[PDB]
Design an enzyme around this catalytic site. Structure first.
Site, PDB file in Angstrom:
ATOM      1  CG  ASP A  35      27.908  20.050  -9.571  1.00 23.60           C
ATOM      2  OD1 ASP A  35      29.091  20.357  -9.349  1.00 23.60           O
ATOM      3  OD2 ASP A  35      27.129  19.675  -8.660  1.00 23.60           O
ATOM      4  CG  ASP A 220      32.387  21.299  -7.032  1.00 26.55           C
ATOM      5  OD1 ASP A 220      31.594  21.234  -7.990  1.00 26.55           O
ATOM      6  OD2 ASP A 220      32.027  21.357  -5.842  1.00 26.55           O
TER       7      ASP A 220
HETATM    8  C1  LIG Z   1      25.408  14.273  -3.463  1.00 21.07           C
HETATM    9  C2  LIG Z   1      26.555  15.208  -3.518  1.00 21.07           C
HETATM   10  C3  LIG Z   1      26.809  15.924  -2.197  1.00 21.07           C
HETATM   11  C4  LIG Z   1      27.864  16.996  -2.301  1.00 21.07           C
HETATM   12  C5  LIG Z   1      28.688  17.354  -3.331  1.00 21.07           C
HETATM   13  C6  LIG Z   1      29.456  18.418  -2.848  1.00 21.07           C
HETATM   14  C7  LIG Z   1      30.507  19.223  -3.546  1.00 21.07           C
HETATM   15  N1  LIG Z   1      30.015  19.898  -4.733  1.00 21.07           N
HETATM   16  C8  LIG Z   1      29.003  20.970  -4.468  1.00 21.07           C
HETATM   17  C9  LIG Z   1      28.275  21.283  -5.786  1.00 21.07           C
HETATM   18  O1  LIG Z   1      27.762  20.067  -6.348  1.00 21.07           O
HETATM   19  C10 LIG Z   1      27.138  22.289  -5.502  1.00 21.07           C
HETATM   20  C11 LIG Z   1      26.223  22.504  -6.710  1.00 21.07           C
HETATM   21  C12 LIG Z   1      25.183  23.619  -6.526  1.00 21.07           C
HETATM   22  C13 LIG Z   1      24.278  23.373  -5.321  1.00 21.07           C
HETATM   23  C14 LIG Z   1      24.360  23.862  -7.781  1.00 21.07           C
HETATM   24  C15 LIG Z   1      23.516  25.120  -7.734  1.00 21.07           C
HETATM   25  C16 LIG Z   1      24.334  26.375  -7.557  1.00 21.07           C
HETATM   26  C17 LIG Z   1      25.300  26.659  -8.725  1.00 21.07           C
HETATM   27  C18 LIG Z   1      26.210  27.869  -8.490  1.00 21.07           C
HETATM   28  C19 LIG Z   1      26.066  28.446  -7.105  1.00 21.07           C
HETATM   29  O2  LIG Z   1      27.339  28.481  -6.476  1.00 21.07           O
HETATM   30  C20 LIG Z   1      27.278  28.530  -5.044  1.00 21.07           C
HETATM   31  C21 LIG Z   1      28.115  27.425  -4.472  1.00 21.07           C
HETATM   32  O3  LIG Z   1      29.335  27.498  -4.533  1.00 21.07           O
HETATM   33  N2  LIG Z   1      27.492  26.344  -3.945  1.00 21.07           N
HETATM   34  C22 LIG Z   1      26.039  26.158  -3.840  1.00 21.07           C
HETATM   35  C23 LIG Z   1      28.351  25.284  -3.435  1.00 21.07           C
HETATM   36  C24 LIG Z   1      28.685  25.467  -1.964  1.00 21.07           C
HETATM   37  C25 LIG Z   1      27.731  23.911  -3.729  1.00 21.07           C
HETATM   38  O4  LIG Z   1      27.324  23.188  -2.821  1.00 21.07           O
HETATM   39  N3  LIG Z   1      27.676  23.568  -5.035  1.00 21.07           N
HETATM   40  N4  LIG Z   1      29.126  18.724  -1.587  1.00 21.07           N
HETATM   41  N5  LIG Z   1      28.146  17.827  -1.281  1.00 21.07           N
END
Ligand SMILES: CCCc1cc(CNC[C@@H](O)[C@@H]2C[C@H](C)CCCCCCOCC(=O)N(C)[C@@H](C)C(=O)N2)n[nH]1
Length: 373
Positions: A35, A220
């Site tokens: 990630d 990302d």
């Molecule tokens: C402390 C940091 C706080 C912070 C980082 C980010 C931006 N980066 C977000 C990513 O790190 C996460 C990582 C995921 C939770 C990992 C498990 C799921 C993997 C594939 C599923 O795909 C669905 C999807 O697209 N998900 C869930 C996104 C909306 C999402 O949230 N992805 N925001 N806030």
């Protein structure tokens, strides 16, 4: 030396890419999601319905408890747990062992995926966004400090179930064709970049380029979709609707909720536009563009023999996210050492019979600094 790491990623579509790691002495084997949009290394550490295995601190002689708590709320999904350290290795990675911070996840909500086959997450972004604060050294920072591994890595994510490569410490030239094009890392927290122009089927969206980076743009690998700020999303969907108006779709398809299905092999690729994102270059007034095909932002899903797809562009209120859908088919170099991110056409790139995903430049673009927010 990088052939050892080629094809070291697996995954299910929509469920992220993972690499195999070991933690603890003796090594406990876990599949760890990669990630670039977070900065915490965390593993399942307690039974969970969806986990096939988990980190067992009591069985590792090198486990040290930091006796601090931690939680991470992602854009969707979240976990809490206990901080510790332990020895970590990447079997199909560099031949090294690092003492790294680990968050032993003890509770989670909408994080683990039913039958996903990974049990943890490797946040490869910078300490600035680590929880609980920026004093928790992220994994990759530990790797570079404790070993001779150079301070960069690259991601080749391949589409459809799915696989790819994470080259740790360098660039593998057999994984891409053409030239690498680099964009500056605007700030070392997320992998933040600046989008200076957007085109759909060659037509400029003609927005103040600040709208594309409101309030940031990031690269990302842990987000599936291309996510766009409200104003940019509306312009884009209005444009993709007009391009594809030859057929009618439920207003819930454009919201990513409902699928669309066609008789297998009759997917009307030619009625969806290509999307071009222009990224700030390395020299004055210079940019380059990446072109995305509908085969990337129409993500395939499981049902019959009809081919079914979900619309993988969604609305955001925390900026643009260049997710896995954008990165598929490109070789992406996270050149931390030189504060830049490179794009090239992947060896597993996406092309139909008449259009091809591309990375093209140089372009001249004026007032690129005005695009930052
Ligand atoms: C402390 C940091 C706080 C912070 C980082 C980010 C931006 N980066 C977000 C990513 O790190 C996460 C990582 C995921 C939770 C990992 C498990 C799921 C993997 C594939 C599923 O795909 C669905 C999807 O697209 N998900 C869930 C996104 C909306 C999402 O949230 N992805 N925001 N806030």
């Amino acid at each position: 030396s990088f052939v050892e790491m080629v094809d070291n990623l697996r995954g299910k579509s929509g469920q992220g890419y993972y690499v195999e790691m070991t933690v603890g002495s003796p090594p406990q084997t876990l599949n760890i999601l990669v990630d670039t949009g977070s900065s915490n290394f965390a593993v399942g550490a307690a039974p969970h319905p969806f986990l096939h295995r988990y980190y067992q601190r009591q069985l590792s002689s090198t486990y040290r408890d930091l006796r601090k708590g931690v939680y991470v709320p992602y854009t969707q999904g979240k976990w809490e747990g206990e901080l510790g350290t332990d020895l970590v290795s990447i079997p199909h990675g560099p031949n090294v062992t690092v003492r790294a911070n680990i968050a032993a996840i003890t509770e989670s909500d909408k994080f683990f995926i039913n039958g996903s086959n990974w049990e943890g997450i490797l946040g490869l972004a910078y300490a600035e966004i680590a929880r609980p604060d920026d004093s928790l050294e992220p994994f990759f920072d530990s790797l570079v400090k404790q070993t001779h591994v150079p301070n960069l890595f690259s991601l080749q994510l391949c589409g459809a179930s799915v696989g790819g490569s994470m080259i740790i410490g360098g660039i593998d030239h057999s994984l891409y064709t053409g030239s690498l094009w680099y964009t500056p890392i605007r700030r070392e927290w997320y992998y933040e970049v600046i989008i200076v122009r957007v085109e759909i089927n060659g037509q400029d969206l003609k927005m103040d380029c600040k709208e594309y980076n409101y309030d940031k743009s990031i690269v990302d690998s842990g987000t599936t979709n291309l996510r766009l700020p409200k104003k940019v999303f509306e312009a884009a969907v209005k444009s993709i609707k007009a391009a594809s108006s030859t057929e009618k779709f439920p207003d819930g398809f454009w919201l990513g909720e409902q699928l669309v299905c066609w008789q297998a092999g009759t997917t009307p690729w030619n009625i969806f536009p290509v999307i071009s994102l222009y990224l700030m270059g390395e020299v004055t007034n210079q940019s380059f563009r990446i072109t995305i095909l509908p085969q990337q932002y129409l993500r395939p899903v499981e049902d019959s023999q009809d081919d079914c797809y979900k619309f993988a562009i969604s609305q955001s209120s925390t900026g643009t996210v260049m997710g896995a859908v954008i990165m598929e088919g490109f070789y992406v170099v996270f050149d931390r050492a030189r504060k830049r991110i490179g794009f090239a056409v992947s060896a597993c790139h996406v092309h139909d019979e008449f259009r091809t995903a591309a990375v093209e430049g140089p372009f001249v673009t004026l007032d690129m600094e005005d695009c930052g927010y």
